[PDB]
mmCIF file of C-alpha atoms and ligand atoms in Angstrom:
data_model
loop_
_atom_site.group_PDB
_atom_site.id
_atom_site.type_symbol
_atom_site.label_atom_id
_atom_site.label_comp_id
_atom_site.label_asym_id
_atom_site.label_seq_id
_atom_site.Cartn_x
_atom_site.Cartn_y
_atom_site.Cartn_z
ATOM 1 C CA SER A 1 154.114 -89.784 98.380
ATOM 2 C CA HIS A 2 155.327 -91.458 95.344
ATOM 3 C CA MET A 3 158.710 -91.579 96.725
ATOM 4 C CA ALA A 4 160.978 -94.584 97.287
ATOM 5 C CA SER A 5 163.343 -95.023 100.113
ATOM 6 C CA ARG A 6 166.325 -95.958 98.093
ATOM 7 C CA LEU A 7 168.190 -95.585 94.779
ATOM 8 C CA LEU A 8 170.291 -97.188 92.361
ATOM 9 C CA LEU A 9 173.901 -96.724 92.215
ATOM 10 C CA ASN A 10 176.057 -97.577 89.058
ATOM 11 C CA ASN A 11 177.825 -100.227 91.229
ATOM 12 C CA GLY A 12 174.590 -102.448 91.514
ATOM 13 C CA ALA A 13 173.989 -101.246 94.943
ATOM 14 C CA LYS A 14 171.203 -99.080 96.290
ATOM 15 C CA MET A 15 171.454 -96.085 98.788
ATOM 16 C CA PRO A 16 168.892 -94.691 100.952
ATOM 17 C CA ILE A 17 168.235 -91.059 99.732
ATOM 18 C CA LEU A 18 168.118 -89.670 103.301
ATOM 19 C CA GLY A 19 170.991 -89.705 105.245
ATOM 20 C CA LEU A 20 171.900 -88.110 108.726
ATOM 21 C CA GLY A 21 174.921 -85.432 108.204
ATOM 22 C CA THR A 22 177.627 -85.605 111.243
ATOM 23 C CA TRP A 23 180.092 -82.477 110.327
ATOM 24 C CA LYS A 24 179.767 -80.461 113.611
ATOM 25 C CA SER A 25 178.002 -83.091 115.638
ATOM 26 C CA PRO A 26 179.957 -82.741 118.733
ATOM 27 C CA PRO A 27 181.661 -86.134 120.280
ATOM 28 C CA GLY A 28 179.839 -86.083 123.016
ATOM 29 C CA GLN A 29 176.178 -85.882 121.418
ATOM 30 C CA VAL A 30 176.848 -87.667 118.355
ATOM 31 C CA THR A 31 176.816 -91.005 119.785
ATOM 32 C CA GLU A 32 173.045 -90.542 120.888
ATOM 33 C CA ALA A 33 172.315 -88.783 117.871
ATOM 34 C CA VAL A 34 173.160 -91.716 115.584
ATOM 35 C CA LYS A 35 171.414 -94.112 118.093
ATOM 36 C CA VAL A 36 168.207 -91.873 117.617
ATOM 37 C CA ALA A 37 168.420 -91.380 113.794
ATOM 38 C CA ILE A 38 168.653 -95.204 113.355
ATOM 39 C CA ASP A 39 165.961 -95.945 115.990
ATOM 40 C CA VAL A 40 163.633 -93.615 114.009
ATOM 41 C CA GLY A 41 164.556 -95.118 110.596
ATOM 42 C CA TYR A 42 167.827 -93.478 109.134
ATOM 43 C CA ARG A 43 169.803 -96.236 107.531
ATOM 44 C CA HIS A 44 172.600 -94.216 105.855
ATOM 45 C CA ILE A 45 175.011 -92.191 108.017
ATOM 46 C CA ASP A 46 177.395 -89.348 106.300
ATOM 47 C CA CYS A 47 180.716 -89.407 108.034
ATOM 48 C CA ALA A 48 184.490 -88.041 107.438
ATOM 49 C CA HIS A 49 187.840 -88.637 109.011
ATOM 50 C CA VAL A 50 188.214 -84.303 109.072
ATOM 51 C CA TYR A 51 184.841 -84.375 111.193
ATOM 52 C CA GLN A 52 187.077 -85.871 114.102
ATOM 53 C CA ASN A 53 183.871 -88.068 115.621
ATOM 54 C CA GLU A 54 184.294 -90.864 113.587
ATOM 55 C CA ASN A 55 184.937 -93.001 116.892
ATOM 56 C CA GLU A 56 181.947 -91.909 118.495
ATOM 57 C CA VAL A 57 179.643 -92.439 115.390
ATOM 58 C CA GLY A 58 181.313 -95.753 115.392
ATOM 59 C CA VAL A 59 179.920 -96.669 118.990
ATOM 60 C CA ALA A 60 176.553 -95.730 117.754
ATOM 61 C CA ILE A 61 176.630 -98.264 114.892
ATOM 62 C CA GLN A 62 177.965 -100.553 116.823
ATOM 63 C CA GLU A 63 175.434 -100.750 119.736
ATOM 64 C CA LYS A 64 172.476 -100.719 117.251
ATOM 65 C CA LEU A 65 174.175 -103.700 115.496
ATOM 66 C CA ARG A 66 174.373 -105.553 118.711
ATOM 67 C CA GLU A 67 170.915 -104.580 119.828
ATOM 68 C CA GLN A 68 169.751 -105.890 116.855
ATOM 69 C CA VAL A 69 167.909 -102.885 115.838
ATOM 70 C CA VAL A 70 169.186 -103.104 112.319
ATOM 71 C CA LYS A 71 171.588 -105.588 110.332
ATOM 72 C CA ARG A 72 174.986 -104.283 108.588
ATOM 73 C CA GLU A 73 173.674 -105.168 105.199
ATOM 74 C CA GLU A 74 170.785 -102.476 105.616
ATOM 75 C CA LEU A 75 173.273 -99.691 106.782
ATOM 76 C CA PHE A 76 175.022 -97.529 104.461
ATOM 77 C CA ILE A 77 177.603 -95.779 105.446
ATOM 78 C CA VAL A 78 179.896 -93.194 104.045
ATOM 79 C CA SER A 79 183.195 -91.631 104.617
ATOM 80 C CA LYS A 80 185.802 -89.467 102.752
ATOM 81 C CA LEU A 81 189.426 -89.440 102.277
ATOM 82 C CA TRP A 82 190.759 -86.324 103.388
ATOM 83 C CA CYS A 83 193.038 -84.140 101.279
ATOM 84 C CA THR A 84 196.143 -84.660 103.163
ATOM 85 C CA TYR A 85 195.941 -88.512 101.888
ATOM 86 C CA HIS A 86 195.843 -88.301 98.250
ATOM 87 C CA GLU A 87 199.325 -89.874 98.054
ATOM 88 C CA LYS A 88 198.952 -93.085 96.366
ATOM 89 C CA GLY A 89 200.603 -94.991 99.256
ATOM 90 C CA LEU A 90 198.368 -93.076 102.083
ATOM 91 C CA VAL A 91 195.173 -93.996 100.678
ATOM 92 C CA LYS A 92 194.483 -97.547 102.050
ATOM 93 C CA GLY A 93 195.761 -96.247 105.715
ATOM 94 C CA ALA A 94 193.684 -93.517 105.649
ATOM 95 C CA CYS A 95 190.629 -95.881 104.902
ATOM 96 C CA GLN A 96 191.578 -98.311 107.250
ATOM 97 C CA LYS A 97 191.818 -95.650 109.995
ATOM 98 C CA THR A 98 188.322 -94.667 109.069
ATOM 99 C CA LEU A 99 187.120 -98.224 109.141
ATOM 100 C CA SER A 100 188.605 -98.712 112.653
ATOM 101 C CA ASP A 101 187.149 -95.779 114.013
ATOM 102 C CA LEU A 102 183.825 -96.573 112.967
ATOM 103 C CA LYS A 103 184.272 -100.109 113.675
ATOM 104 C CA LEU A 104 183.281 -101.312 110.131
ATOM 105 C CA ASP A 105 184.920 -103.803 107.772
ATOM 106 C CA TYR A 106 183.551 -102.172 104.971
ATOM 107 C CA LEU A 107 182.262 -98.677 103.851
ATOM 108 C CA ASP A 108 179.546 -98.831 101.514
ATOM 109 C CA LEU A 109 180.642 -95.596 100.074
ATOM 110 C CA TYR A 110 184.080 -93.693 100.184
ATOM 111 C CA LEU A 111 184.597 -90.558 98.583
ATOM 112 C CA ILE A 112 187.367 -87.896 97.787
ATOM 113 C CA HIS A 113 186.718 -85.471 100.114
ATOM 114 C CA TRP A 114 188.011 -82.227 97.993
ATOM 115 C CA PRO A 115 189.825 -82.470 94.380
ATOM 116 C CA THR A 116 192.535 -80.774 96.050
ATOM 117 C CA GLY A 117 195.465 -82.426 97.559
ATOM 118 C CA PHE A 118 197.711 -81.091 100.709
ATOM 119 C CA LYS A 119 201.107 -82.098 101.856
ATOM 120 C CA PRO A 120 200.665 -85.165 104.192
ATOM 121 C CA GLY A 121 201.236 -84.838 107.872
ATOM 122 C CA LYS A 122 199.327 -84.344 111.246
ATOM 123 C CA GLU A 123 197.816 -81.064 110.296
ATOM 124 C CA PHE A 124 194.603 -81.181 107.754
ATOM 125 C CA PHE A 125 195.722 -77.865 106.713
ATOM 126 C CA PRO A 126 199.282 -77.458 106.315
ATOM 127 C CA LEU A 127 200.607 -74.120 105.867
ATOM 128 C CA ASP A 128 203.763 -72.355 104.760
ATOM 129 C CA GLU A 129 205.279 -69.562 106.865
ATOM 130 C CA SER A 130 203.177 -67.078 105.065
ATOM 131 C CA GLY A 131 199.943 -68.904 105.669
ATOM 132 C CA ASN A 132 199.285 -70.420 102.552
ATOM 133 C CA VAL A 133 198.182 -74.126 102.529
ATOM 134 C CA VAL A 134 200.731 -76.526 101.240
ATOM 135 C CA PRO A 135 199.626 -78.556 98.058
ATOM 136 C CA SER A 136 200.755 -82.081 97.356
ATOM 137 C CA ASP A 137 201.771 -82.822 93.758
ATOM 138 C CA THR A 138 199.695 -85.821 93.510
ATOM 139 C CA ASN A 139 197.240 -85.439 90.637
ATOM 140 C CA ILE A 140 193.872 -87.019 91.019
ATOM 141 C CA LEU A 141 193.933 -89.477 88.274
ATOM 142 C CA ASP A 142 196.438 -91.369 90.527
ATOM 143 C CA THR A 143 194.265 -91.035 93.591
ATOM 144 C CA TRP A 144 191.359 -92.227 91.820
ATOM 145 C CA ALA A 145 193.297 -95.735 90.874
ATOM 146 C CA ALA A 146 194.305 -95.758 94.586
ATOM 147 C CA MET A 147 190.534 -95.377 95.372
ATOM 148 C CA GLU A 148 189.691 -98.314 92.835
ATOM 149 C CA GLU A 149 192.416 -100.498 94.864
ATOM 150 C CA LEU A 150 190.189 -100.057 97.763
ATOM 151 C CA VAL A 151 187.093 -101.740 96.047
ATOM 152 C CA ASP A 152 189.340 -104.641 94.906
ATOM 153 C CA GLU A 153 190.775 -105.098 98.351
ATOM 154 C CA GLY A 154 187.099 -105.137 99.669
ATOM 155 C CA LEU A 155 187.547 -102.422 102.093
ATOM 156 C CA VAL A 156 184.861 -100.244 100.177
ATOM 157 C CA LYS A 157 181.957 -101.529 98.192
ATOM 158 C CA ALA A 158 181.692 -98.355 96.227
ATOM 159 C CA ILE A 159 183.973 -95.301 95.476
ATOM 160 C CA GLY A 160 183.083 -91.659 94.621
ATOM 161 C CA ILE A 161 183.639 -87.806 94.573
ATOM 162 C CA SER A 162 182.837 -84.670 96.525
ATOM 163 C CA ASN A 163 182.895 -80.978 95.422
ATOM 164 C CA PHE A 164 184.175 -82.055 91.796
ATOM 165 C CA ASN A 165 182.919 -79.388 89.155
ATOM 166 C CA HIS A 166 181.929 -80.716 85.810
ATOM 167 C CA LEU A 167 185.342 -80.941 84.221
ATOM 168 C CA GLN A 168 186.956 -82.631 86.932
ATOM 169 C CA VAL A 169 184.046 -85.511 86.980
ATOM 170 C CA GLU A 170 184.721 -85.554 83.213
ATOM 171 C CA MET A 171 188.330 -85.944 83.901
ATOM 172 C CA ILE A 172 187.790 -88.963 85.929
ATOM 173 C CA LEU A 173 185.639 -90.353 83.358
ATOM 174 C CA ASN A 174 188.196 -89.874 80.555
ATOM 175 C CA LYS A 175 190.825 -91.213 82.685
ATOM 176 C CA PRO A 176 193.065 -93.793 80.550
ATOM 177 C CA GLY A 177 192.224 -97.356 82.096
ATOM 178 C CA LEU A 178 189.388 -96.196 84.013
ATOM 179 C CA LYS A 179 188.220 -99.344 86.143
ATOM 180 C CA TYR A 180 185.252 -97.972 88.368
ATOM 181 C CA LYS A 181 183.502 -95.035 87.498
ATOM 182 C CA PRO A 182 182.318 -92.594 90.504
ATOM 183 C CA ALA A 183 179.401 -93.818 92.033
ATOM 184 C CA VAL A 184 178.332 -90.362 93.806
ATOM 185 C CA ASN A 185 179.314 -86.633 93.542
ATOM 186 C CA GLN A 186 178.692 -85.005 96.840
ATOM 187 C CA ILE A 187 177.919 -81.118 96.526
ATOM 188 C CA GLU A 188 176.536 -78.361 98.084
ATOM 189 C CA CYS A 189 172.920 -77.752 96.939
ATOM 190 C CA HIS A 190 169.585 -75.943 98.518
ATOM 191 C CA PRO A 191 167.323 -73.322 96.814
ATOM 192 C CA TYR A 192 170.099 -70.590 97.065
ATOM 193 C CA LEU A 193 172.769 -73.031 95.024
ATOM 194 C CA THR A 194 170.679 -75.135 93.026
ATOM 195 C CA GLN A 195 173.092 -76.528 90.850
ATOM 196 C CA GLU A 196 170.939 -77.359 87.619
ATOM 197 C CA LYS A 197 174.048 -77.844 85.194
ATOM 198 C CA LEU A 198 176.413 -79.852 87.553
ATOM 199 C CA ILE A 199 173.554 -82.096 88.432
ATOM 200 C CA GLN A 200 172.228 -82.677 85.024
ATOM 201 C CA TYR A 201 175.888 -83.422 83.832
ATOM 202 C CA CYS A 202 176.517 -86.124 86.623
ATOM 203 C CA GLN A 203 172.867 -87.710 86.205
ATOM 204 C CA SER A 204 173.394 -87.934 82.447
ATOM 205 C CA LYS A 205 176.585 -89.781 83.425
ATOM 206 C CA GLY A 206 174.652 -92.087 85.680
ATOM 207 C CA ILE A 207 176.332 -90.472 88.843
ATOM 208 C CA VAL A 208 174.221 -90.239 91.636
ATOM 209 C CA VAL A 209 174.113 -86.487 93.405
ATOM 210 C CA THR A 210 174.070 -86.111 97.045
ATOM 211 C CA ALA A 211 173.137 -82.838 98.257
ATOM 212 C CA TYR A 212 174.685 -81.710 101.395
ATOM 213 C CA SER A 213 174.211 -78.511 103.440
ATOM 214 C CA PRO A 214 170.652 -78.734 102.510
ATOM 215 C CA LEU A 215 169.072 -76.420 105.339
ATOM 216 C CA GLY A 216 171.930 -74.074 104.568
ATOM 217 C CA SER A 217 173.989 -75.159 107.621
ATOM 218 C CA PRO A 218 172.981 -72.563 110.073
ATOM 219 C CA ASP A 219 175.773 -73.871 112.282
ATOM 220 C CA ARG A 220 178.739 -73.273 109.861
ATOM 221 C CA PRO A 221 181.460 -71.427 111.930
ATOM 222 C CA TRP A 222 182.056 -68.968 109.477
ATOM 223 C CA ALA A 223 178.437 -67.542 109.217
ATOM 224 C CA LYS A 224 177.544 -63.790 109.534
ATOM 225 C CA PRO A 225 174.431 -61.616 109.882
ATOM 226 C CA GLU A 226 174.366 -60.503 106.272
ATOM 227 C CA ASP A 227 174.078 -64.237 104.976
ATOM 228 C CA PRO A 228 170.520 -65.075 103.763
ATOM 229 C CA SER A 229 168.871 -67.934 105.573
ATOM 230 C CA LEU A 230 166.845 -70.433 104.313
ATOM 231 C CA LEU A 231 164.988 -71.297 107.487
ATOM 232 C CA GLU A 232 163.841 -67.861 107.758
ATOM 233 C CA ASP A 233 163.164 -67.261 104.143
ATOM 234 C CA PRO A 234 159.226 -66.368 104.610
ATOM 235 C CA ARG A 235 158.794 -67.772 100.770
ATOM 236 C CA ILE A 236 159.734 -70.962 101.882
ATOM 237 C CA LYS A 237 158.172 -71.044 105.226
ATOM 238 C CA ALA A 238 154.729 -69.988 103.073
ATOM 239 C CA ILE A 239 155.059 -73.370 100.776
ATOM 240 C CA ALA A 240 155.702 -75.235 104.119
ATOM 241 C CA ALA A 241 152.539 -73.932 106.058
ATOM 242 C CA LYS A 242 150.447 -74.844 102.819
ATOM 243 C CA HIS A 243 151.572 -78.377 103.055
ATOM 244 C CA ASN A 244 151.492 -78.200 107.086
ATOM 245 C CA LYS A 245 154.967 -79.483 107.204
ATOM 246 C CA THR A 246 158.210 -77.221 108.777
ATOM 247 C CA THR A 247 160.458 -75.184 106.683
ATOM 248 C CA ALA A 248 163.293 -77.807 106.917
ATOM 249 C CA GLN A 249 160.788 -80.637 105.838
ATOM 250 C CA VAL A 250 160.281 -78.776 102.531
ATOM 251 C CA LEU A 251 163.984 -78.256 102.284
ATOM 252 C CA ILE A 252 164.902 -81.770 102.734
ATOM 253 C CA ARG A 253 161.974 -82.815 100.142
ATOM 254 C CA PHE A 254 163.171 -80.434 97.570
ATOM 255 C CA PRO A 255 166.242 -82.342 96.690
ATOM 256 C CA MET A 256 164.546 -85.764 96.833
ATOM 257 C CA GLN A 257 162.178 -85.037 94.282
ATOM 258 C CA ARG A 258 165.028 -84.092 91.984
ATOM 259 C CA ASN A 259 166.425 -87.657 92.247
ATOM 260 C CA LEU A 260 169.000 -86.473 94.759
ATOM 261 C CA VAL A 261 170.197 -88.269 97.861
ATOM 262 C CA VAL A 262 170.251 -85.436 100.715
ATOM 263 C CA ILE A 263 171.993 -85.710 104.282
ATOM 264 C CA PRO A 264 170.847 -83.368 106.760
ATOM 265 C CA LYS A 265 172.761 -82.939 110.065
ATOM 266 C CA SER A 266 171.244 -82.837 113.516
ATOM 267 C CA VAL A 267 171.911 -83.592 117.034
ATOM 268 C CA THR A 268 168.624 -82.730 118.512
ATOM 269 C CA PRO A 269 166.450 -85.938 118.971
ATOM 270 C CA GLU A 270 163.232 -84.004 117.845
ATOM 271 C CA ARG A 271 164.683 -82.617 114.805
ATOM 272 C CA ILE A 272 166.306 -85.694 113.996
ATOM 273 C CA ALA A 273 162.653 -87.531 113.645
ATOM 274 C CA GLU A 274 161.296 -84.254 111.976
ATOM 275 C CA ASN A 275 163.792 -84.341 109.471
ATOM 276 C CA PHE A 276 162.939 -88.072 108.484
ATOM 277 C CA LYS A 277 159.208 -87.476 108.334
ATOM 278 C CA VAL A 278 159.409 -86.461 104.638
ATOM 279 C CA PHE A 279 157.646 -89.404 102.917
ATOM 280 C CA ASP A 280 154.011 -88.297 103.592
ATOM 281 C CA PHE A 281 153.606 -85.167 101.224
ATOM 282 C CA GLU A 282 154.552 -83.760 97.737
ATOM 283 C CA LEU A 283 155.726 -80.935 96.284
ATOM 284 C CA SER A 284 154.166 -79.609 93.123
ATOM 285 C CA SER A 285 156.155 -78.990 89.941
ATOM 286 C CA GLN A 286 154.907 -75.384 90.401
ATOM 287 C CA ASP A 287 156.226 -75.452 94.304
ATOM 288 C CA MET A 288 159.472 -77.134 92.505
ATOM 289 C CA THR A 289 160.085 -74.693 90.229
ATOM 290 C CA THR A 290 159.617 -71.779 92.471
ATOM 291 C CA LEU A 291 161.898 -73.268 95.074
ATOM 292 C CA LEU A 292 164.564 -73.439 92.006
ATOM 293 C CA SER A 293 164.148 -69.842 91.366
ATOM 294 C CA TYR A 294 165.576 -68.776 94.625
ATOM 295 C CA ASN A 295 169.225 -69.661 93.399
ATOM 296 C CA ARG A 296 172.030 -67.258 94.257
ATOM 297 C CA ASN A 297 174.874 -69.293 93.534
ATOM 298 C CA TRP A 298 175.503 -68.816 97.290
ATOM 299 C CA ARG A 299 177.788 -71.299 99.102
ATOM 300 C CA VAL A 300 178.374 -72.261 102.707
ATOM 301 C CA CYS A 301 181.478 -74.336 101.569
ATOM 302 C CA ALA A 302 183.761 -72.242 99.266
ATOM 303 C CA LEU A 303 186.923 -73.542 100.794
ATOM 304 C CA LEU A 304 188.390 -69.885 100.529
ATOM 305 C CA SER A 305 191.735 -70.968 101.930
ATOM 306 C CA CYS A 306 192.322 -72.997 99.060
ATOM 307 C CA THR A 307 191.356 -70.535 95.676
ATOM 308 C CA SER A 308 195.058 -70.568 94.534
ATOM 309 C CA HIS A 309 195.316 -74.268 94.660
ATOM 310 C CA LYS A 310 195.494 -75.736 91.012
ATOM 311 C CA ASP A 311 192.693 -78.115 91.903
ATOM 312 C CA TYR A 312 190.336 -75.601 93.512
ATOM 313 C CA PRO A 313 186.939 -76.568 91.866
ATOM 314 C CA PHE A 314 184.837 -73.350 92.246
ATOM 315 C CA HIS A 315 186.413 -70.825 89.780
ATOM 316 C CA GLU A 316 184.459 -72.723 86.841
ATOM 317 C CA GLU A 317 181.044 -72.176 86.097
ATOM 318 C CA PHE A 318 180.053 -75.463 87.065
HETATM 319 N N1 NAP B 1 181.285 -83.150 101.316
HETATM 320 C C1 NAP B 1 181.458 -81.915 101.466
HETATM 321 O O1 NAP B 1 182.504 -81.336 101.675
HETATM 322 C C2 NAP B 1 180.379 -81.560 102.788
HETATM 323 C C3 NAP B 1 180.215 -80.367 103.314
HETATM 324 C C4 NAP B 1 179.278 -79.925 103.767
HETATM 325 C C5 NAP B 1 178.477 -80.963 104.631
HETATM 326 N N2 NAP B 1 178.482 -82.141 104.306
HETATM 327 C C6 NAP B 1 177.615 -83.229 104.752
HETATM 328 O O2 NAP B 1 176.254 -82.563 104.871
HETATM 329 C C7 NAP B 1 175.869 -82.609 106.082
HETATM 330 C C8 NAP B 1 174.864 -81.597 106.364
HETATM 331 O O3 NAP B 1 175.170 -80.278 105.959
HETATM 332 P P1 NAP B 1 175.653 -79.270 107.263
HETATM 333 O O4 NAP B 1 175.796 -79.827 108.591
HETATM 334 O O5 NAP B 1 176.795 -78.403 106.431
HETATM 335 O O6 NAP B 1 174.273 -78.557 107.317
HETATM 336 P P2 NAP B 1 172.613 -78.820 107.334
HETATM 337 O O7 NAP B 1 172.275 -79.977 107.346
HETATM 338 O O8 NAP B 1 172.063 -77.804 106.316
HETATM 339 O O9 NAP B 1 172.182 -77.772 108.761
HETATM 340 C C9 NAP B 1 172.577 -78.401 109.817
HETATM 341 C C10 NAP B 1 172.120 -77.267 111.042
HETATM 342 O O10 NAP B 1 170.665 -77.233 110.830
HETATM 343 C C11 NAP B 1 170.195 -77.222 112.099
HETATM 344 N N3 NAP B 1 168.992 -78.164 111.746
HETATM 345 C C12 NAP B 1 168.794 -79.509 111.393
HETATM 346 N N4 NAP B 1 167.444 -79.927 111.370
HETATM 347 C C13 NAP B 1 166.701 -78.813 111.618
HETATM 348 C C14 NAP B 1 165.330 -78.710 112.006
HETATM 349 N N5 NAP B 1 164.512 -79.592 111.575
HETATM 350 N N6 NAP B 1 164.954 -77.521 112.251
HETATM 351 C C15 NAP B 1 165.758 -76.164 112.292
HETATM 352 N N7 NAP B 1 167.196 -76.493 112.282
HETATM 353 C C16 NAP B 1 167.635 -77.897 112.075
HETATM 354 C C17 NAP B 1 171.086 -78.299 113.018
HETATM 355 O O11 NAP B 1 171.035 -78.042 114.254
HETATM 356 P P3 NAP B 1 171.192 -79.234 115.393
HETATM 357 O O12 NAP B 1 172.335 -80.480 115.075
HETATM 358 O O13 NAP B 1 171.516 -78.422 116.679
HETATM 359 O O14 NAP B 1 169.778 -79.763 115.731
HETATM 360 C C18 NAP B 1 172.275 -77.621 112.614
HETATM 361 O O15 NAP B 1 172.859 -76.559 113.330
HETATM 362 C C19 NAP B 1 177.284 -82.492 106.861
HETATM 363 O O16 NAP B 1 176.969 -82.782 108.398
HETATM 364 C C20 NAP B 1 178.150 -82.970 106.432
HETATM 365 O O17 NAP B 1 177.771 -84.536 106.954
HETATM 366 C C21 NAP B 1 179.654 -82.432 103.468
HETATM 367 C C1 SFI B 2 192.874 -73.793 106.736
HETATM 368 S S1 SFI B 2 191.579 -72.734 107.230
HETATM 369 C C2 SFI B 2 189.944 -73.702 106.898
HETATM 370 C C3 SFI B 2 189.840 -73.845 105.456
HETATM 371 C C4 SFI B 2 188.624 -74.677 104.798
HETATM 372 C C5 SFI B 2 187.752 -74.903 106.001
HETATM 373 C C6 SFI B 2 186.402 -75.497 105.346
HETATM 374 C C7 SFI B 2 185.731 -76.545 105.823
HETATM 375 C C8 SFI B 2 184.419 -77.050 105.194
HETATM 376 C C9 SFI B 2 184.062 -76.518 104.092
HETATM 377 C C10 SFI B 2 184.298 -78.275 105.779
HETATM 378 C C11 SFI B 2 182.805 -78.836 105.514
HETATM 379 C C12 SFI B 2 183.303 -80.172 104.759
HETATM 380 O O1 SFI B 2 184.418 -79.933 103.869
HETATM 381 O O2 SFI B 2 182.841 -81.109 104.732
HETATM 382 C C13 SFI B 2 185.231 -78.402 106.911
HETATM 383 C C14 SFI B 2 184.959 -79.785 107.836
HETATM 384 C C15 SFI B 2 186.128 -79.725 108.710
HETATM 385 F F1 SFI B 2 186.358 -80.767 109.511
HETATM 386 C C16 SFI B 2 187.198 -78.837 108.851
HETATM 387 C C17 SFI B 2 187.046 -77.843 107.691
HETATM 388 C C18 SFI B 2 186.141 -77.554 106.967
HETATM 389 C C19 SFI B 2 187.802 -74.547 107.180
HETATM 390 C C20 SFI B 2 188.888 -73.810 107.876
#
């Protein structure tokens, strides 16, 4: 289908363009979900400390390594530094905690989960008595230096960012004494949020973009009835039907043809397999442009708690 399975990052490593997402995958189901994914061909898993299921994901990876279904070098494991760990002195420990839970001795990619730093502590979202999230005074350039140390200590092969707008990406690229550029910016992207500008900017700098919530995150906990629904969009279903594929398969193939990495989440064995079977057809340039035309600047993940945080990413146009 004129589609290679991996693309080149600016650290010299290759990254599988299809990965399994794990946000919201319940701890009692994610182990089998990851086993099934690897069994059917996935080599890239997207994780995060904040998803609270890294231990269970790790059980799956470890078993598949033990069974010799796959070698570690063939796996591409991604995790993310949570906001309460931006303080320089906490970054390594957060990384090591994720490594211990995932049962790995290194990550292929470690991302700053959000540009917004929070006060350190047990709570993922520390609040003042009025309900506001309490920020940290750490700035993202120092956090980036801490991330660079992880590469130099061998804990991760690549470092990157997530939910950074183009000015924030630019701030890193212009950092005095920058040692390693971000390899990846992982951002929300689907036909209702097409991200033409941010994607063009990142790619122009050699930063690879990963598209999250490619199916529109129907299981997002804050979903409402008025919300659009990609999987129910007759226009998208029509394109699927024309190709004898499912609507989800079209939604996953879409970012692949824009040179994006994409990470659909499922804990359903049947859908896990379906979501991987997207290398056997090609959307036309017309299909692509039609899908792009559906942009609404509609976000699943707007982090509405933190609009007042100085580093909140989504006030900027991109
Ligand atoms: N960096 C960030 O801040 C950030 C933010 C959001 C997401 N992400 C990453 O991106 C991943 C994917 O995003 P997401 O979890 O928000 O949502 P998503 O992948 O767009 O959609 C997941 C939902 O779609 C369902 N689904 C999966 N395959 C399907 C299919 N073939 N047909 C019908 N329904 C299907 C899943 O149900 P079942 O699981 O029940 O099958 C689940 O409810 C996340 O898991 C996470 O790893 C990162
Ligand atoms: C402090 S009240 C609040 C504020 C923000 C959010 C938003 C969240 C979003 C967008 C995500 C997905 C992601 O960032 O990957 C998330 C994952 C988690 F484990 C926990 C919370 C959140 C949820 C609740």
